[PDB]
């Protein structure tokens, strides 16, 4: 390898520690790696960024998939990769993103703790932007595969105030898993993401996870809870349920009779959501047990729910004060 080429590139190579201040500003640690709240040192920008050090070293499959994909994607409702740093000395890969101050996990928990349920305008706006982001991913044949409140980010004060940013920790709590996965489906589908979105919408409406459950693809108690809420599917409701590899296990463990008084209508009534509402009718189309009977993200965006007063807003907080706490440093 040519010496002149090497020293030249080394001299011009931007380093994360030279460009950004993130010492003691860690805001997450996980299997994904580490995430810091960073600000530019050379103070042109003066704006917050999320800085991810990818777990491991080198170009792992994980680092490669995240870089390859996020390099191409461009939508207001999907988290955006701004810059990639390759640290030659230690082979660490750093990724710089939009900083989203908030997320649905903390937002829902804040409201669930206050016992003030979610404002109805905010819920509609959250759901619309989520759908809009997923529709963009799905049109590009990008499945999310782990949609849940923790992965719906929401921007704080700034130029994108109250805008949803879909993110991922890279997992790849079964509360958002579609029944087909629980019954051993082998492939992820657009329908699986739609189920999860239905689950998030119910949670936004009630403040409680709809398929809440205590902590091999088959999980008995998670199916039990789904049937406690939805009822047990009739042959007519999901004809291909018999083709699922765990179908016989389901028949062994469960009796239709156990869930005769159970339905989504009855569940939502107990949490003071009206079954006559356009909200409930959209929710029921998202939470359909048979995946081929679930509406697509585009059809959900076209629902009359979003034409009803109040209209979705770009800022989910509709110009109001944000009561939710900022992220704490670790």
């Amino acid at each position: 390898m040519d010496y002149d080429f090497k020293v030249k590139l080394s001299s011009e190579r931007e380093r994360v520690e030279d460009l950004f201040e993130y010492e003691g500003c860690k805001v997450g640690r996980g299997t994904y790696g580490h995430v810091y709240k960073a600000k530019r040192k050379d103070g042109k920008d003066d704006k917050d960024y999320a800085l991810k050090q990818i777990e491991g070293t080198g170009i792992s499959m994980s680092a490669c998939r995240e870089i390859a994909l996020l390099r191409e994607l461009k939508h207001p409702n999907v988290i955006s990769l701004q810059k990639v740093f390759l640290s030659h000395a230690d082979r660490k890969v750093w990724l710089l993103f939009d900083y989203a101050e908030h997320d649905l996990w903390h937002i829902i928990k804040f409201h669930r703790a206050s016992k003030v349920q979610l404002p109805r305008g905010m819920v509609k706006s959250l759901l619309y932007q989520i759908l809009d982001g997923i529709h963009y991913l799905h049109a590009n044949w990008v499945l999310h595969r782990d949609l849940k409140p923790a992965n719906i980010l929401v921007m704080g004060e700034g130029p994108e105030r109250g805008r949803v940013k879909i993110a991922d920790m890279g997992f790849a709590t079964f509360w958002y898993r579609a029944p087909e996965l629980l019954l051993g489906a082998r492939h992820y589908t657009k329908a699986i993401d739609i189920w999860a979105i239905g689950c998030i919408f119910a949670e936004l409406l009630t403040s409680e996870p709809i398929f809440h459950c205590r902590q091999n693809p088959y999980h008995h108690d998670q199916l039990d809870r789904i049937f406690n809420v939805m009822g047990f599917p009739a042959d007519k409701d999901w004809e291909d349920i018999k083709k699922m590899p765990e179908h016989s296990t389901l028949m062994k463990d469960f009796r239709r009779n156990t869930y005769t008084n159970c339905s989504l209508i009855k569940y939502m009534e107990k949490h003071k959501v009206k079954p006559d509402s356009k909200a409930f009718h959209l929710l029921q189309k998202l939470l359909t047990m048979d995946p081929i009977k679930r509406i697509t993200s585009e059809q959900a965006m076209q629902d009359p729910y979003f034409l009803e007063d109040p209209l979705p807003t770009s800022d989910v907080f509709a110009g109001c004060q944000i009561p939710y706490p900022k992220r704490e440093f670790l």
Partner: protein
């Protein structure tokens, strides 16, 4: 269907990695002090063949080999052949491409054994010494490659549009094998850096139609496309077959490789 399939016009491929021919030719003058234009083209055919052979040995689908080939081309579109040994870069491109196209991390042992065995068994006319690089060299080179490419990993190729074009004609059995091989042959030129893939597909399909004496004049007239551009690509294809004829890779490549500029070591 595959990720980002319909996104070419909003892609990093289109927006950053379709180059101006004059900009490409300007950056090539560095190496043209050492090599003639003909010799530089001969070298790029040779390394296209090396990448194809590596991919074949590893049992990789043509699409992984094509992506590896584009990565290699993009590197030396910007930099001199002396910056990093292309004997090292070739297997690095296959290795990175294999991760991107979701066929996995080729193991330490298998990548190095593949580089060693291909050079030794299929390319001994070019190389007297055994493959000298080890996995730590590949991993360093992969970091340089990813940087040059500005982390632009997803690459579009003419195979998909080609398949769609012949299906529309109703001539898949008759024309596809020949047109497909003509698309393989275009990777021994600069075409992938200069034109959208769908345009390269139409050019290969046109040449397949002329070779097999199929009249597709009506069908080509009915496309909404710049036919002057398609004719430029066809000319490059026809020229590549006259170069192929006149070139004996096996007689010439040892001398051409010795004329290639080589890395300056530390002081």
């Amino acid at each position: 269907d595959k990720a980002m399939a319909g996104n070419f016009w909003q892609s990093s491929h289109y927006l950053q990695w379709i180059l101006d021919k004059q900009d490409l030719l300007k950056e090539r003058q560095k190496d043209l002090k050492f090599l003639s234009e003909e010799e530089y083209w001969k070298l790029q055919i040779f390394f296209t063949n090396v990448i194809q052979a590596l991919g074949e040995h590893l049992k990789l689908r043509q699409q992984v080999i094509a992506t590896a080939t584009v990565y290699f081309k993009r590197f030396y579109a910007r930099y001199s052949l002396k910056s990093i040994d292309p004997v090292l870069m070739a297997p690095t491109c296959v290795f990175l491409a294999s991760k991107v196209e979701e066929f996995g991390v080729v193991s330490n042992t298998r990548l190095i054994a593949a580089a060693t065995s291909v050079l030794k068994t299929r390319f001994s006319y070019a190389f007297p010494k055994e493959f000298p690089y080890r996995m730590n060299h590949i991993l360093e080179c992969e970091f340089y490659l990813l940087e040059l490419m500005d982390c632009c990993l997803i690459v579009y190729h003419p195979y998909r549009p080609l398949l769609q074009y012949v299906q529309d004609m109703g001539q898949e059995d008759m024309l596809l094998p020949l047109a497909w091989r003509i698309v393989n042959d275009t990777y021994r030129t600069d075409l992938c850096l200069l034109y959208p893939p769908f345009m390269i597909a139409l050019a290969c399909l046109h040449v397949a139609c002329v070779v097999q004496q199929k009249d597709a004049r009506q069908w080509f007239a009915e496309l909404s496309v710049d036919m002057e551009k398609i004719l430029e690509i066809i000319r490059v294809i026809l020229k590549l077959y006259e170069q192929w004829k006149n070139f004996d890779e096996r007689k010439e490549m040892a001398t051409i490789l010795s004329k290639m500029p080589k890395p300056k070591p530390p002081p």
